[PDB]
Amino acid sequence: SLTITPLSPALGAQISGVDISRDISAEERDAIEQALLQHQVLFLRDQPINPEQQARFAARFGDLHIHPIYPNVPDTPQVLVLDTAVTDVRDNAVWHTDVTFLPTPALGAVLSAKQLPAYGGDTLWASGIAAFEALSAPLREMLDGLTATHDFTKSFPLERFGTTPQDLARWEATRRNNPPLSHPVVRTHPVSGRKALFVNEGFTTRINELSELESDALLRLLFAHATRPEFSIRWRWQENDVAFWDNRVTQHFAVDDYRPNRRVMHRATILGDAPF
Amino acid sequence: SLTITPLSPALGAQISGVDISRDISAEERDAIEQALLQHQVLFLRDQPINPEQQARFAARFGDLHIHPIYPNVPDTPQVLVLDTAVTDVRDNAVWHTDVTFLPTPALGAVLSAKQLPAYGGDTLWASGIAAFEALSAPLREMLDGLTATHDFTKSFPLERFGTTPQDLARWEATRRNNPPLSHPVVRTHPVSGRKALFVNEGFTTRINELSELESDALLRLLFAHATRPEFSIRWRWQENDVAFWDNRVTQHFAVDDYRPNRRVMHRATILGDAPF
Amino acid sequence: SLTITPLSPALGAQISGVDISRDISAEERDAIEQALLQHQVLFLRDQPINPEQQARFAARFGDLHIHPIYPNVPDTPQVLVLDTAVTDVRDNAVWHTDVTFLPTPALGAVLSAKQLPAYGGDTLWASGIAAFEALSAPLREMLDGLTATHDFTKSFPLERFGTTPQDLARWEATRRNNPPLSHPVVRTHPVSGRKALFVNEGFTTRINELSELESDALLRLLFAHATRPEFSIRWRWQENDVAFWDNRVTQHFAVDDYRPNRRVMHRATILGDAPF
């Protein structure tokens, strides 16, 4: 009774007839993996789930990122608590693909809607696959093969740390650990083989094989193009919603329009491999 | 009974518990009027209506438009049939405010969904009001009081329409009937007094008081800014949905991602006055 | 004898030691032709000439264009009088390659400075050859082979000329006689074989093999790139100067900073062939 309902041609599907708060069968797991590989972002409603059950579900689709440093559920360091009462989430109101400044950016995440404002706070997703397919041939030919630099300081500039000398040293220290690195501009999905634009406003600073000026123009083009209505969907949250997206070929945008209302989410991140 | 559920802080509400296939009470009409003034675009689901019913409901909020040349219902001259089998709708996939090239652009419209593709074909709306209020003070200050040229030919260029030296007669005649005219860049709603950005990439060509080079840069900015996620919503159609929007302070976008599948909408347009 | 002093690495050269008011020798002609093929735009100071001599000189380098109605010298329908007291030149203050909306844009022109303001009215030239060569390999790979639309209406909007029943018929006839056409984005010089960027902000409206959106970004990039200082020169005019440029691989820009002072130039235009 596992049911997959596509939400739009470019990406997105809703799933029902499966209780992911319990161990799912092999068949169900594989049915959802296929849906992910096809639709890239999956939604389930009326699916309450605790962090332990959320981790047990996400771990079925890859290894989980362990964290004791970020806002965690004490019992499960595999599930991250996102609380607007504790952490400002304003910088999520930008198109981004998660941790693309890493050598192996996250495979994806399972997100749980715990506490929501009456309304507002939508999240959008955009398909790198659909976006890439819609580019003109000559543009696809040129970009496929090129590489781009990703740098965490684009989303975490010096001013976001502090104007104090020790805030400056912290910024230099985290920079040493996460120096700028490169990924293909057109990424081949490691499972499905589907090609996708793999730059995002959050982290992409430079198309390496173009000049600074040429790069600025192309990236501004690609940033605007890839986030067009044709390549995206918009989710209006309800409590107990669950979202499961493939971070290897999407970007997303957390609309910040509900301050100072409290919003609480739970996140489990699935580890990814090297983009090629 | 009648309930009004906001969909987003910027714009949009859903109304249910009111049967608009039958005459609505003066109180219902007034409630919906206020909802429109507040939320700018209203949605009702599971609301089947024939053309005649659609017209008397629409007529409750202003005078309806009679169009003889465009495809409409035989007996109801004021309800327009939008059928993808008959007419192509590719150029609706562009942020536009309806007929802003006229001295008195449409007040708004009532739209009914008759026949829908299995999925796809979402429509987005954007609040000129929310967009304006989100601009910096120095920008609101400079823009408020300026005027802008709206040109029919920007959506209906020569190569796209008037494709024959025989059809060109139809172009030269319309280009001669609807010359470029101007409207305030910042419009004051004629009923609520709420101020809204009143430009759209669909018809706006030039900010009159700025130079060509200046205007181009400002419009590129405003076009991007006014359609950011913060100021918009996305509606996934279901048959028998009704949409009711205020075309005096909004823009909309009809995603064309369902070709060649058939889509059929019915529209009643409400006449507006001069923007000031 | 003949002396050729390069002005800048990208383009431009001053020539001396030849009196072009008299018939030049074959060897001199060929020396100047070679300098044109190398330096693209040539300058001769202290070379007074009448229209008769200027036409005789120009004709040694290709067939001359004949235009009666356009302000010219009665004795020499080959030489055109450009007088700011008669014709507004405000529209030459934009980067353009001459008549690229024609299937055979001009080969070049020989220009003579008759009367000049005390100061101002500089003319700049840009090299399409140096600009193309400085592009990144990927960009050159992509552009080399594409085509672009050229349209005179980009520089001559109907709102610029024509209001009378005749004036409107005057425009529609011209537009009818000069439909948009295409030229290669990367032109191969039909003599030297050198490759040049062949788009200009004056006339180029669209790169054909790209979408409107993609084209728009690429042209803005190219318009800016091709006119950077690295690829251009700026001539400060003196009376009796003669300029001779290859219009097949350059753009130029006439600075209008001398109003209302009078400026009179004489121009002989050399017919060109089909760009490829």
Added chain:
Amino acid sequence: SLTITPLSPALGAQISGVDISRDISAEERDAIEQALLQHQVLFLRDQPINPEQQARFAARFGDLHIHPIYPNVPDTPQVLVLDTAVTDVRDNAVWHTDVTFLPTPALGAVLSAKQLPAYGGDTLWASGIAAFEALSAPLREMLDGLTATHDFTKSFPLERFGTTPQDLARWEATRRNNPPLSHPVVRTHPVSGRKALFVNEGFTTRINELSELESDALLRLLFAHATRPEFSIRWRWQENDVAFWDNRVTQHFAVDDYRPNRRVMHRATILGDAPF
């Protein structure tokens, strides 16, 4: 006989009939000063001078900046040596106003041409006074009173000097000692009272009173606007040339199109005050 020859309406003048290898009379000093205030950038040809003579001249127009490290010139540290054999000048091929990241950017500079390549290495100057006046009134009104951040790391980013650990703590301290700071977008010349645009692509990163998105669009507009031909001049150097410009209301650009040929200039910087 001190003679002043205006080169172009927007800015620039050539001065002759004065030997600046020797002391200048008060009458001359004041004439040059007035010429500086009117024309913003002054050029003298055939004026061979040595470091001592050059400092004596520049000192007549304000207090000179001392170069305490690696001088060059030993006996005259007020004169910096710019030799491409030792220093890469590629960075100067960008539109910039000198040290605007300092609270009191340089008043101006006296530059001497010691050794030049056969050709190439032109320098351009642009007038912020002429640029400001050419803006539309609405735009002049909005900008006049705003402030912009200047940051040296815009021109000198970390990846400009290497990961050599010495530079990691050495460069880190340079940013600590030169943090981002602000200046008026529209500067009032402290002597003449003439208003000028005071932003430059070199160091200006953000218009403060606007959002990042708005600032981005505006600065892109201004950067292009201020460097248009209308507002600029181009100087083709000769050995023994002297340039003397006002860095309070202009920006300049050094073309790097002569590598690897050797270029040697001597520079004397006049200290400036706080922009307002």
